[PDB]
Amino acid sequence: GLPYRIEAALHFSNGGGVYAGIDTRTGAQVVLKEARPHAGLAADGADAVTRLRHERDMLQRLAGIDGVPAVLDHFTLGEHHFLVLERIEGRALNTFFAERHPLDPEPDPGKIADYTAWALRVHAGVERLIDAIHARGIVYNDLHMFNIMVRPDETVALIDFEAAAPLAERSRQTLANPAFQAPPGRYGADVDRYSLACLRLALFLPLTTLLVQDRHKAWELAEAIAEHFPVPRGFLREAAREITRD
Amino acid sequence: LPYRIEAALHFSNGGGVYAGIDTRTGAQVVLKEARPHAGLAADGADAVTRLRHERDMLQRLAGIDGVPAVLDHFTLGEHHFLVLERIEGRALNTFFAERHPLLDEPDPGKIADYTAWALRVHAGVERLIDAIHARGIVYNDLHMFNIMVRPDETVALIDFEAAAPLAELANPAFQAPPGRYGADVDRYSLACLRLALFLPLTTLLVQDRHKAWELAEAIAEHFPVPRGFLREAAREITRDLP
Ligand SMILES: Nc1ncnc2c1ncn2[C@@H]1O[C@H](CO)[C@H](O)[C@H]1O
């Protein structure tokens, strides 16, 4: 009875799945997230349905922001919740680290300068987006390469908002970034300020060194990037300043 | 150190999965990493805890064809790494958008090729799950996203974080039934998989398990699936309903 044709199974995790579909009335591309309840223990945490409704709430707080997927529809069949979101076209930032990173040992500085400009675009777009989210009273809590969409026109977007929370809440909980240890004792907009600094270095470091080097090496990492990329040098300095503020 | 990360595959609950190559032997490997306190869940488990648990399950299942081997595991500071063998092939869920939508006024030869293919894949999933139970552990996340179809059409399973000993839930297509335990949890998932291989995606998500017999009827009208196959699935899925 649905007006949506589900055409692809993208992901499933913890009672929640993500599918690509089609509005049959308009042909419009959509994304479907759905959740099923789990009667369980408190130690089990929030179930898929509870986390689905929080994400919908957060996306409704952020409606109208360019870079935040719109909520098109929501319904329940029995206790099966469905959340219909607009589909952000483009590629996630983590898929650029496959090819666009091996900037080989000795490459053409034409491509080096082009990449530095490109990376600074992406961080600036992600920062503007994060700023607009803070203006609604929301702190994204999960900023990293796997959540950042790079659209065909080079503008950016963020995919998963299940981890976002109101800014007024004061929570010592810090989610870790793929590259550096979670910073001890941070809340409010400072959590995103930290992830953005991590992203400023990650955009230039090769994947292997990303996972291996810890946050005490940030100063070394900034100086190393400066010698190999034409970055305005205080830009990298300020990232290492933010990552090592404790 | 002895690995070169080539691609960033996924990051969830403070844990990253990366594709890599052993710099010595040149072999393809999968890198999983976790930092302490990261991904702290309501039950006190962090990403290191889950990674330690996944290695334990993989070690108890060593030697089973279809369970990725544990190649390496080490720490770099407080940073834990788990190096697994790369399963070649495609995840079963990527076929559900490519192989079986065109089989809507369809070509009967292709309908038959797909049917024999799906019964082979499901039978291989059955044997893998049987060998795993024999080793005393129950898979818990058996569904199309966890099954790899290798080049030779043999199957493997991919994520063993959810695995647990038989001593001590929801499926993409249907709700988990109340109070099933032991190896019976895995056989419910296998039953759901039987109908899932033959249903269109929208009917999978929309139809609940009260309609199992109806969906089994619908499947036999499009596919040459033996009826006992579909009825064992419908019966197992409804075994505790009015
Ligand atoms: N609202 C949305 N628009 C486009 N893609 C979405 C999406 N929500 C999830 N995805 C897809 O999930 C994967 C990353 O979690 C994929 O990287 C990502 O494509």
Ligand SMILES: Nc1ncnc2c1ncn2[C@@H]1O[C@H](CO)[C@H](O)[C@H]1O
């Ligand atoms: N040993 C392995 N061989 C191939 N792919 C692996 C893998 N381990 C994990 N993946 C891929 O990572 C994602 C989530 O773990 C995907 O679920 C999964 O495709």
